């Protein structure tokens, strides 16, 4: 099973990807997580994203396309995968189409802009696994600790309010057109498209998605 998650920054894609990964046994491909990992480890493929993410700008299509191709070519992706934050632009989506990377579901997370800022300020992350929590809306079982490893959670470096707003502007300019892109694909029978209300509680969004995936 191959899935794309579409949605604005902070819409909850990473949150719901964990449940889909757990239940269907497919790896999460989060280009944001992969880029931050490459910066932290100084990997030749990705370390260039340091200054770009710090400026709250998008990374070149060329770099993330290469990262995704490398990641997809791994053993754990022959049985499907979930794309989280990719594709982010029309060229990235065209790059998948050119490579024959068809997908079974495209799932759009609808969240009003006005909710994004308050979500990000409360976000806490477990960098090794990409698991994310919210101190108010989705807290860990123990404050400041990852539910899985018990390790101390951190805050992402690019989560200042000004940076979130810059990322939302880029989303609407560059990424929102993917709604129509994949709606057209679904109308041609190439994928299943579904829009979910991302303002519901986490467990309810999970249930709505479970009803789609089966
Ligand atoms: N393909 C690409 N091309 C170019 N550049 C790329 C790229 N991919 C990455 N990059 C670069 O990398 C940077 C970061 O990318 P990325 O890592 O993708 O971050 P982002 O774009 O800011 O999106 P988020 O990860 O913040 O949103 P999310 O949907 O995962 O929300 P989450 O589940 O965390 O939830 C957010 C918060 O809300 C909470 N929450 C979740 N669900 C709910 C709910 N139902 N109710 C209440 N709160 C909730 C969570 O607890 C959490 O605290 C970009 O700026 C870009 O430069
Ligand atoms: Co995310």
Could you tell me which CATH number the domain at 1-214 has?
A: 3.40.50.300
**Residue 47: which residues within 8 A CB-CB, separation 6 or more?**
38, 39, 41
The set of catalytic residues is 13, 88, 123, 156, 167
| 119 known ligand binder | no
- Asked if residue 28 has its Cβ within 6 Å of ligand 1, the reply is no
In whole angstroms, give the CA distance from residue 127 to residue 125: 6
CA atoms 149, 198, 168, 92: torsion sign: positive
Scan for tokens 């053993």, then name that residue: 75
Conformation bin of residue 140: beta by default, left when phi > 0, alpha when psi is -120 to 50: beta
Mutate to test the pocket of ligand 1, among 55, 119, 169, 178 (most ligand atoms within 8 A of CB): 119
Spell out a b/e string for 62-95, using b for 16 or more CB atoms within 10 Å of the CB, else e.
Answer: ebbbebbeebbeeeeeeebbbbbbbbbbeebbeb
- Asked if residue 31 has its Cβ within 6 Å of ligand 1, the reply is yes
Residue nearest to atom 47 of ligand 1 (CA): 137
Q: Which helix (H) or strand (E) holds 143?
A: none
Separation of 12 CA from ligand 1 center, angstroms?
Answer: 7
| 14 known ligand binder | yes
């Amino acid at each position: 099973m191959r899935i794309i998650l579409l949605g604005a920054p902070g819409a909850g894609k990473g949150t719901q990807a964990q449940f889909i990964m757990e239940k269907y046994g497919i790896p999460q491909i989060s280009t944001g997580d992969m880029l931050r990992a490459a910066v932290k480890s100084g990997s030749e493929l990705g370390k260039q994203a340091k200054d770009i993410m710090d400026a709250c700008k998008l990374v070149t299509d060329e770099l993330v396309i290469a990262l995704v191709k490398e990641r997809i070519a791994q053993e754990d992706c022959r049985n499907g995968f979930l794309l989280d934050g990719f594709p982010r632009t029309i060229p990235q989506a065209d790059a998948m189409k050119e490579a024959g990377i068809n997908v079974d579901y495209v799932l759009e997370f609808d969240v009003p802009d006005e909710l994004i800022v308050d979500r990000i300020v409360g976000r806490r992350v477990h960098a090794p696994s990409g698991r994310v929590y919210h101190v108010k809306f989705n807290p860990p079982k123990v404050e400041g600790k990852d539910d899985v490893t018990g390790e101390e959670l951190t805050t992402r470096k690019d989560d200042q309010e000004e940076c979130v707003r810059k990322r939302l502007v880029e989303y609407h300019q560059m990424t929102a057109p993917l709604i129509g892109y994949y709606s057209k694909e679904a109308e041609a029978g190439n994928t299943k498209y579904a829009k979910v209300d991302g303002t519901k509680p986490v467990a309810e969004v999970r249930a709505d998605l479970e009803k789609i995936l089966g």
